[PDB]
């Protein structure tokens, strides 16, 4: 998309991730793992779920209308009744075409942004304890167990306590 996250700096998606839309993959002393992220996922689902309700009216009732089918030739009165219906259908056909194209465009942009927002959120937490490897990956430069990984995912990672350990690993 425009942010260049999905199908951009991130190479591909994960088929294995079934419990959420966005998530993590990590590796440390205690092995590897995969954990979803609920905050980014929920924010994306609320924007997409029943998104047409925000523009289209709750389908209402229409009763007796004009005649739209004729078995004879009448002329001026009939041509107008046919012309009114043709003019109407062509306009709704265009509105339907334009709406879907915009909402689909909106879906691709909002999902691509939620990917980018989760990345930039994590980068700010890590400060100078980690580097961006490319491919949407981070190289953390200190001892980081599953308890330490967990603090990043819920948002309580204090970089200050690791900083001195990381800066020595990064430049020496």
């Amino acid at each position: 998309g425009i942010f260049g996250a999905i199908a951009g700096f991130i190479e591909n998606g994960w088929e294995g991730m079934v419990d959420g839309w966005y998530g993590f993959r990590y590796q440390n002393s205690e092995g590897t793992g995969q954990a979803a992220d609920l905050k980014s996922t929920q924010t994306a689902i609320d924007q997409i779920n029943e998104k047409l309700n925000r523009v289209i009216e709750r389908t209402n009732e229409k009763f007796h209308q004009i005649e739209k089918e004729f078995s004879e030739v009448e002329g001026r009165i009939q041509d107008l009744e046919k012309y009114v219906e043709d003019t109407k259908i062509d306009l709704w056909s265009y509105n339907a075409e334009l709406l879907v194209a915009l909402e689909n465009q909106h879906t691709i942009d909002l999902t691509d942004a939620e990917m980018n927002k989760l990345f930039e959120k994590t980068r700010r937490q890590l400060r100078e304890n980690a580097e961006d490897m490319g491919g949407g990956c981070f190289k953390i430069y200190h001892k980081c167990d599953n308890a330490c990984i967990g603090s990043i995912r819920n948002g309580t990672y204090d970089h200050y306590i690791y900083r001195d350990e990381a800066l020595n690993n990064r430049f020496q």
Partner: protein, 325 residues
């Protein structure tokens, strides 16, 4: 460079979900683009049959709305009926005196929207003339007859005295009087039935009036009749009055139909009616009204999606799909 990940290091990668079998949609940027999920917004399929458990559907069968209103012998079952939607079959026909209606469509629309054939008789006094005239072209049972709601007036003895009656509306609703005039086949038949050579019918309210002159001439035989009849209607509002003056050719009314500001209508279709759940109806049976648009028929009734030219429109209900490997 070290193959083993040091205990003083760790890797953390961020990613999005994917699916092996994706679906294509259209955006502003791309014609086709693969997304994790999609949904259809065009109902292109009908149920194949009309439902009658939400709106009251009345099958017209062999009769049209007008042939059921006037009192065509084979439409006597449709008396004192009411509907939200009337179904007119294409195989329907007329089987009474041959007629025409100037602006036939306008009358059809008024009664279909009214949504009721509630009739009420009235005591019209036609002094000095015969009543209940009937033809061989309109066989009720196994004998000559006529439209049950209309009354054919002819001479008595050797005179058709100038008819003049009045009927005021003291009710609290609109009256719809269906009346008409008869067109003979010749001057000979004119004076035979109605004495005076120049027939005339004047139906007037306080602010409006409709004056009709007969038409004479040989016409094609319809059920053994070269003669025809023309139908006209008159709306009498609360407080207004009706008056009918004529010196011949009058096909008089027997009473009034009740009028309503309803939500009813009429539809042309040849699809069966049966038990089911649906709030939308078309000439192809009922339709599911979940999707915002549809592609079955431009003629619709009830809680229906908007008709469009497109048969398919895919909305993305998911992100950009990017499979592995």
């Amino acid at each position: 460079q070290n193959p083993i990940s040091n205990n003083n290091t760790a890797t953390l990668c961020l990613g999005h979900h994917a699916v092996a079998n994706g679906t294509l949609v259209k955006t502003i940027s791309d014609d086709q683009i693969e997304v994790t999920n999609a949904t259809e917004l065009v109902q292109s399929i009908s149920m194949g049959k009309i439902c009658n458990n939400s709106y009251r559907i009345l099958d017209g069968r062999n009769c049209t709305l007008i042939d059921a209103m006037l009192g065509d012998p084979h439409c006597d079952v449709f008396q004192y009926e009411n509907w939200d939607l009337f179904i007119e079959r294409s195989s329907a026909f007329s089987n009474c005196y041959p007629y025409d209606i100037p602006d036939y469509a306008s009358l059809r629309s008024i009664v279909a929207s009214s949504g009721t054939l509630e009739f009420t008789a009235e005591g019209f006094t036609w002094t000095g003339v015969t009543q209940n005239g009937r033809s061989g072209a309109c066989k009720r049972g196994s004998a000559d007859s006529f439209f049950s709601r209309l009354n054919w007036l002819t001479k008595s003895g050797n005179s058709y005295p100038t008819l003049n009656v009045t009927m005021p509306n003291n009710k609290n609703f609109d009256k719809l009087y269906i009346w008409g005039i008869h067109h003979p086949s010749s001057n000979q038949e004119q004076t035979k039935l109605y004495i005076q050579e120049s027939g005339r019918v004047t139906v007037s309210t306080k602010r409006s009036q409709q004056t009709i002159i007969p038409n004479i001439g040989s016409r094609p035989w319809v059920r053994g009749q070269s003669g025809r009849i023309s139908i006209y209607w008159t709306i009498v509002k609360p407080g207004d009055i009706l008056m009918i003056n004529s010196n011949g050719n009058l096909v008089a009314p027997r009473g009034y139909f009740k009028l309503k500001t309803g939500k009813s209508s009429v539809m042309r279709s040849d699809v069966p009616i049966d038990i089911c759940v649906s709030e939308c109806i078309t000439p192809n049976g009922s339709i599911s009204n979940e999707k915002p648009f549809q592609n079955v028929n431009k003629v619709t009734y009830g809680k229906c999606p908007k008709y469009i030219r497109q048969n398919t429109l895919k909305l993305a209900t998911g992100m950009r799909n990017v499979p592995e490997k």
